[PDB]
Design an enzyme around this catalytic site. Structure first.
Site, PDB file in Angstrom:
ATOM      1  CG  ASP A 157      12.369  19.717 -44.466  1.00  0.00           C
ATOM      2  OD1 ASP A 157      12.988  20.568 -45.118  1.00  0.00           O
ATOM      3  OD2 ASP A 157      11.527  18.962 -44.990  1.00  0.00           O
ATOM      4  CG  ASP A 158      18.333  17.781 -46.639  1.00  0.00           C
ATOM      5  OD1 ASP A 158      17.871  16.819 -47.279  1.00  0.00           O
ATOM      6  OD2 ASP A 158      19.555  17.970 -46.478  1.00  0.00           O
ATOM      7  CB  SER A 159      18.797  14.428 -42.364  1.00  0.00           C
ATOM      8  OG  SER A 159      19.661  13.903 -41.377  1.00  0.00           O
TER       9      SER A 159
END
Length: 205
Positions: A157-159
């Site tokens: 989920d980390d951009s």
DNA sequence: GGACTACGGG
DNA sequence: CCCGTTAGTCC
């Protein structure tokens, strides 16, 4: 060591992984499992949507303002600090409130002990810590990686990770969380190290 | 000088 | 995936 095993496992997947590991070099990821849960959690909360440099300046101001010793403030010390004093350290008002909440929970022994957290699977960590205001999937992943030292966390989920996965996997646009999870499945059981290697990509330019 | 750069709030 | 936040870097 597990890092050496991880490096060989990743390199064994395919030529691109092999090349990435060679370009970046040995993994130097340095977690801090000596930190108490409330400390690791506050550090992770602070880091949300902020550069490492910003997070660092904030925590440093936090220590100088709230500690008797310029060490990480204790739960009691945090509780004794009014929200605006926290805020002037550079936490957003909302994070300041959440940090008070974390401290109060620690002070009241409502956070799982360090001993029990160290026995919990990622799934159990997610179930247990996500009750804390300001602490959801990403924050728990960052706590698991940079504090606990867990080796198979894929923070899909980390951009930033999505953007580096875009580059590494040769994608023409930003992958969804679920796409990153599929693409990095072969990296198990060292997905934390896989994520760390992808995160080093901007340093190669 | 800036553009914008996970999470709760309304 | 309505809207706004904390700071520092490097675009």
């Amino acid at each position: 060591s597990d890092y050496k095993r991880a490096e060989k496992h990743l390199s064994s997947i395919d030529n691109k992984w092999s090349s990435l590991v060679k370009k970046v070099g040995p993994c130097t990821l340095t977690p801090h499992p000596e930190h108490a849960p409330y400390e690791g959690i506050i550090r992770a909360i602070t880091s949300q949507k902020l550069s490492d440099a910003a997070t660092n300046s904030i925590i440093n101001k936090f220590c100088t303002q709230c500690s008797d010793n310029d060490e990480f403030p204790t739960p009691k010390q945090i509780m004794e600090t009014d929200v605006e004093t926290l805020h002037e350290c550079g936490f957003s008002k909302l994070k300041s409130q959440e940090i008070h909440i974390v401290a109060e929970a620690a002070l009241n022994k409502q956070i799982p002990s360090k001993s029990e957290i160290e026995k919990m699977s990622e799934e159990e960590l997610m179930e247990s810590l996500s009750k804390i205001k300001g602490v959801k999937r990403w924050t728990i992943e960052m706590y698991s990686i940079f504090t606990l030292g867990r080796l198979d966390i894929m923070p899909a989920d980390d951009s930033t990770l999505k953007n580096e996965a875009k580059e590494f996997f040769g994608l023409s646009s930003k992958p969804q969380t679920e796409e990153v999870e599929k693409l990095t499945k072969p990296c198990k059981p060292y997905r934390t190290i896989a994520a760390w290697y992808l995160w080093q990509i901007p340093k190669l330019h």
